PDB file of C-alpha atoms in Angstrom:
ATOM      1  CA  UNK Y   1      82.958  98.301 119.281  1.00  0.00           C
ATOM      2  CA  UNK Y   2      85.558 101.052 117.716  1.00  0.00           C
ATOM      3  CA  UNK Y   3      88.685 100.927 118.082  1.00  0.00           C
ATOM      4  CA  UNK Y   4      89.187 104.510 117.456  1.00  0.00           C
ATOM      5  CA  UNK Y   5      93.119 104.671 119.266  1.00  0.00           C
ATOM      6  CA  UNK Y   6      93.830 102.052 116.598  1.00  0.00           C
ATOM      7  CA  UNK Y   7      93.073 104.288 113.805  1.00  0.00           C
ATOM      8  CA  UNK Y   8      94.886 106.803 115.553  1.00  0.00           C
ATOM      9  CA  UNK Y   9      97.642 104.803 115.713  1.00  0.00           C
ATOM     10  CA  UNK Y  10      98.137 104.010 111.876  1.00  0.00           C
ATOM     11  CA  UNK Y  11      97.810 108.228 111.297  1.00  0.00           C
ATOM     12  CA  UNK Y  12     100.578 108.213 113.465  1.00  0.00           C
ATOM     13  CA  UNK Y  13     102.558 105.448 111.468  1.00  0.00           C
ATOM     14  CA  UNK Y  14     102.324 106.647 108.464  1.00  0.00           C
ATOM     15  CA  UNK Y  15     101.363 110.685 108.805  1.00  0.00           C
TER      16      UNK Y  15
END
């Protein structure tokens, strides 16, 4: 599993 759009999505949160 990755859950590679999540990561993405906590950049995009706090970047």
């Amino acid at each position: 599993q990755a859950p590679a759009y999540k990561k993405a999505a906590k950049k995009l949160a706090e970047s």
